[PDB]
Amino acid sequence: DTGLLSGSEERVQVALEELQDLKGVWSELSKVWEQIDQMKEQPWVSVQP
Amino acid sequence: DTGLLSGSEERVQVALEELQDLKGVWSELSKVWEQIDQMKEQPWVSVQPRKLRQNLDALLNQLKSFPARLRQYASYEFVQRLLKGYMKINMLVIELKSEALKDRHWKQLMKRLHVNWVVSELTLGQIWDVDLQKNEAIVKDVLLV
């Protein structure tokens, strides 16, 4: 037994929290990307602004 | 004792079953005419005549999936004859994407069709409103020129 590396534990904690944050971010960005891709698949010449 | 007319409630439950059947029929018809609305309001920016034929056959086959009681209703005959009568967009609408479309060609067609137009949003929702099988003669003259 010895002094456990609390730096490793806090690194794991911050990795987990930033991972969940970025997972939500990527979900939102994927939704934005798919909607804008569906918008741009059509020429949009005669569709009102 | 008060012997009541049970035939009243038998008719009630028969009408309830018919009501549920009609509710299903009209839910399917609501889906059908919602698809009709999307293929209507489309300003003809990406749709092709082959896509119109695909939509026609898709609507026909999903309609023909009605069961016996749902297929024999008058509304089924109405929608089926409507689809058969419109079984027509691909035939005439090959004029807009052609090079023959221009400002005065739009003007002469707009005089022939007698409706008013806005150039910015060229929506087929009003193009089809002037039914093509009804005014085929004038548009063909607009075509032929």
mmCIF file of all heavy atoms in Angstrom, chain A residues 41-49, chain B residues 42-46 120-123:
data_model
loop_
_atom_site.group_PDB
_atom_site.id
_atom_site.type_symbol
_atom_site.label_atom_id
_atom_site.label_comp_id
_atom_site.label_asym_id
_atom_site.label_seq_id
_atom_site.Cartn_x
_atom_site.Cartn_y
_atom_site.Cartn_z
ATOM 1 N N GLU A 41 -28.703 18.642 -50.480
ATOM 2 C CA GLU A 41 -28.850 17.636 -51.526
ATOM 3 C C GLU A 41 -29.722 18.147 -52.667
ATOM 4 O O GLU A 41 -29.528 17.755 -53.823
ATOM 5 C CB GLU A 41 -29.427 16.348 -50.937
ATOM 6 C CG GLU A 41 -29.614 15.229 -51.947
ATOM 7 C CD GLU A 41 -30.213 13.984 -51.331
ATOM 8 O OE1 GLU A 41 -30.571 14.023 -50.135
ATOM 9 O OE2 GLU A 41 -30.324 12.963 -52.041
ATOM 10 N N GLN A 42 -30.669 19.028 -52.365
ATOM 11 C CA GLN A 42 -31.498 19.634 -53.396
ATOM 12 C C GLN A 42 -30.868 20.942 -53.875
ATOM 13 O O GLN A 42 -30.255 21.661 -53.082
ATOM 14 C CB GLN A 42 -32.904 19.899 -52.863
ATOM 15 C CG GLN A 42 -33.608 18.655 -52.349
ATOM 16 C CD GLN A 42 -33.370 18.424 -50.869
ATOM 17 O OE1 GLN A 42 -33.583 19.316 -50.048
ATOM 18 N NE2 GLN A 42 -32.921 17.224 -50.521
ATOM 19 N N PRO A 43 -30.987 21.257 -55.169
ATOM 20 C CA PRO A 43 -30.433 22.528 -55.664
ATOM 21 C C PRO A 43 -30.956 23.757 -54.939
ATOM 22 O O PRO A 43 -30.196 24.712 -54.734
ATOM 23 C CB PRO A 43 -30.850 22.525 -57.139
ATOM 24 C CG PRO A 43 -30.892 21.084 -57.510
ATOM 25 C CD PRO A 43 -31.228 20.299 -56.261
ATOM 26 N N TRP A 44 -32.232 23.761 -54.544
ATOM 27 C CA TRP A 44 -32.862 24.906 -53.881
ATOM 28 C C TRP A 44 -32.784 26.155 -54.765
ATOM 29 O O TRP A 44 -32.115 27.140 -54.449
ATOM 30 C CB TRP A 44 -32.238 25.156 -52.500
ATOM 31 C CG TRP A 44 -33.028 26.086 -51.614
ATOM 32 C CD1 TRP A 44 -33.145 27.441 -51.737
ATOM 33 C CD2 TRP A 44 -33.798 25.722 -50.460
ATOM 34 N NE1 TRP A 44 -33.944 27.942 -50.739
ATOM 35 C CE2 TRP A 44 -34.357 26.908 -49.941
ATOM 36 C CE3 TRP A 44 -34.071 24.511 -49.818
ATOM 37 C CZ2 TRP A 44 -35.172 26.916 -48.810
ATOM 38 C CZ3 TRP A 44 -34.882 24.522 -48.696
ATOM 39 C CH2 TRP A 44 -35.421 25.717 -48.204
ATOM 40 N N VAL A 45 -33.470 26.082 -55.904
ATOM 41 C CA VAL A 45 -33.511 27.194 -56.849
ATOM 42 C C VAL A 45 -34.873 27.871 -56.782
ATOM 43 O O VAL A 45 -34.969 29.103 -56.819
ATOM 44 C CB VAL A 45 -33.200 26.725 -58.281
ATOM 45 C CG1 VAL A 45 -32.916 27.920 -59.180
ATOM 46 C CG2 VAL A 45 -32.025 25.763 -58.281
ATOM 47 N N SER A 46 -35.935 27.071 -56.685
ATOM 48 C CA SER A 46 -37.299 27.588 -56.669
ATOM 49 C C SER A 46 -37.971 27.444 -55.309
ATOM 50 O O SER A 46 -39.193 27.607 -55.214
ATOM 51 C CB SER A 46 -38.141 26.896 -57.746
ATOM 52 O OG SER A 46 -39.524 27.018 -57.466
ATOM 53 N N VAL A 47 -37.212 27.145 -54.258
ATOM 54 C CA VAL A 47 -37.745 27.033 -52.903
ATOM 55 C C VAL A 47 -37.482 28.344 -52.178
ATOM 56 O O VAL A 47 -36.344 28.830 -52.157
ATOM 57 C CB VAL A 47 -37.119 25.849 -52.151
ATOM 58 C CG1 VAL A 47 -37.859 25.602 -50.845
ATOM 59 C CG2 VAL A 47 -37.131 24.603 -53.021
ATOM 60 N N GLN A 48 -38.525 28.901 -51.567
ATOM 61 C CA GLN A 48 -38.470 30.262 -51.056
ATOM 62 C C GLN A 48 -37.388 30.403 -49.983
ATOM 63 O O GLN A 48 -37.104 29.456 -49.244
ATOM 64 C CB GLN A 48 -39.828 30.670 -50.486
ATOM 65 C CG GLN A 48 -40.222 29.948 -49.206
ATOM 66 C CD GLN A 48 -40.898 28.616 -49.466
ATOM 67 O OE1 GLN A 48 -40.772 28.041 -50.547
ATOM 68 N NE2 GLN A 48 -41.620 28.117 -48.470
ATOM 69 N N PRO A 49 -36.752 31.575 -49.897
ATOM 70 C CA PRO A 49 -35.730 31.778 -48.856
ATOM 71 C C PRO A 49 -36.272 31.657 -47.443
ATOM 72 O O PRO A 49 -35.513 31.327 -46.523
ATOM 73 C CB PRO A 49 -35.208 33.195 -49.145
ATOM 74 C CG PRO A 49 -35.706 33.547 -50.511
ATOM 75 C CD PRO A 49 -36.965 32.779 -50.715
ATOM 76 N N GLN B 42 -44.245 20.447 -54.043
ATOM 77 C CA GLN B 42 -42.864 20.434 -54.502
ATOM 78 C C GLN B 42 -42.694 21.402 -55.671
ATOM 79 O O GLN B 42 -43.438 21.311 -56.657
ATOM 80 C CB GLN B 42 -42.460 19.024 -54.924
ATOM 81 C CG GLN B 42 -41.224 18.965 -55.804
ATOM 82 C CD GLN B 42 -39.965 19.384 -55.071
ATOM 83 O OE1 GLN B 42 -39.800 19.098 -53.885
ATOM 84 N NE2 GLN B 42 -39.069 20.066 -55.774
ATOM 85 N N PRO B 43 -41.739 22.329 -55.606
ATOM 86 C CA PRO B 43 -41.560 23.307 -56.686
ATOM 87 C C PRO B 43 -40.877 22.766 -57.932
ATOM 88 O O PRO B 43 -40.466 23.565 -58.778
ATOM 89 C CB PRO B 43 -40.691 24.395 -56.026
ATOM 90 C CG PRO B 43 -40.676 24.083 -54.556
ATOM 91 C CD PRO B 43 -40.871 22.614 -54.455
ATOM 92 N N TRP B 44 -40.747 21.447 -58.065
ATOM 93 C CA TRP B 44 -40.059 20.814 -59.189
ATOM 94 C C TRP B 44 -38.632 21.344 -59.322
ATOM 95 O O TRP B 44 -38.241 21.943 -60.324
ATOM 96 C CB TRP B 44 -40.846 20.991 -60.491
ATOM 97 C CG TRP B 44 -40.344 20.122 -61.605
ATOM 98 C CD1 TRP B 44 -39.509 20.491 -62.620
ATOM 99 C CD2 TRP B 44 -40.616 18.730 -61.797
ATOM 100 N NE1 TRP B 44 -39.261 19.420 -63.441
ATOM 101 C CE2 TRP B 44 -39.926 18.326 -62.957
ATOM 102 C CE3 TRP B 44 -41.383 17.789 -61.104
ATOM 103 C CZ2 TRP B 44 -39.981 17.021 -63.440
ATOM 104 C CZ3 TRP B 44 -41.433 16.495 -61.585
ATOM 105 C CH2 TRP B 44 -40.737 16.123 -62.741
ATOM 106 N N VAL B 45 -37.854 21.117 -58.265
ATOM 107 C CA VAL B 45 -36.442 21.449 -58.262
ATOM 108 C C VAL B 45 -35.557 20.211 -58.373
ATOM 109 O O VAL B 45 -34.491 20.279 -58.996
ATOM 110 C CB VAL B 45 -36.081 22.268 -57.004
ATOM 111 C CG1 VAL B 45 -34.639 22.751 -57.067
ATOM 112 C CG2 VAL B 45 -37.037 23.440 -56.843
ATOM 113 N N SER B 46 -35.975 19.079 -57.803
ATOM 114 C CA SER B 46 -35.202 17.845 -57.860
ATOM 115 C C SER B 46 -35.982 16.644 -58.375
ATOM 116 O O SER B 46 -35.353 15.643 -58.739
ATOM 117 C CB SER B 46 -34.640 17.499 -56.474
ATOM 118 O OG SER B 46 -33.797 18.530 -55.992
ATOM 119 N N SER B 120 -40.343 34.085 -58.082
ATOM 120 C CA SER B 120 -39.368 33.608 -57.103
ATOM 121 C C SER B 120 -39.641 32.164 -56.698
ATOM 122 O O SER B 120 -38.756 31.305 -56.784
ATOM 123 C CB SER B 120 -39.373 34.520 -55.877
ATOM 124 O OG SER B 120 -40.672 34.617 -55.321
ATOM 125 N N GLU B 121 -40.867 31.870 -56.273
ATOM 126 C CA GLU B 121 -41.242 30.523 -55.846
ATOM 127 C C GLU B 121 -42.100 29.906 -56.944
ATOM 128 O O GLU B 121 -43.306 30.153 -57.020
ATOM 129 C CB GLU B 121 -41.974 30.552 -54.508
ATOM 130 C CG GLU B 121 -42.493 29.192 -54.061
ATOM 131 C CD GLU B 121 -43.506 29.290 -52.938
ATOM 132 O OE1 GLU B 121 -44.583 29.883 -53.156
ATOM 133 O OE2 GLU B 121 -43.226 28.772 -51.836
ATOM 134 N N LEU B 122 -41.470 29.105 -57.801
ATOM 135 C CA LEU B 122 -42.184 28.400 -58.865
ATOM 136 C C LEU B 122 -42.604 27.028 -58.333
ATOM 137 O O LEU B 122 -41.937 26.010 -58.522
ATOM 138 C CB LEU B 122 -41.313 28.296 -60.112
ATOM 139 C CG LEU B 122 -41.943 27.856 -61.439
ATOM 140 C CD1 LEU B 122 -41.156 28.449 -62.598
ATOM 141 C CD2 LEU B 122 -42.033 26.347 -61.581
ATOM 142 N N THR B 123 -43.731 27.028 -57.628
ATOM 143 C CA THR B 123 -44.216 25.820 -56.975
ATOM 144 C C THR B 123 -45.216 25.093 -57.866
ATOM 145 O O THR B 123 -46.139 25.704 -58.412
ATOM 146 C CB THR B 123 -44.843 26.159 -55.621
ATOM 147 O OG1 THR B 123 -45.418 24.980 -55.044
ATOM 148 C CG2 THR B 123 -45.910 27.242 -55.759
#
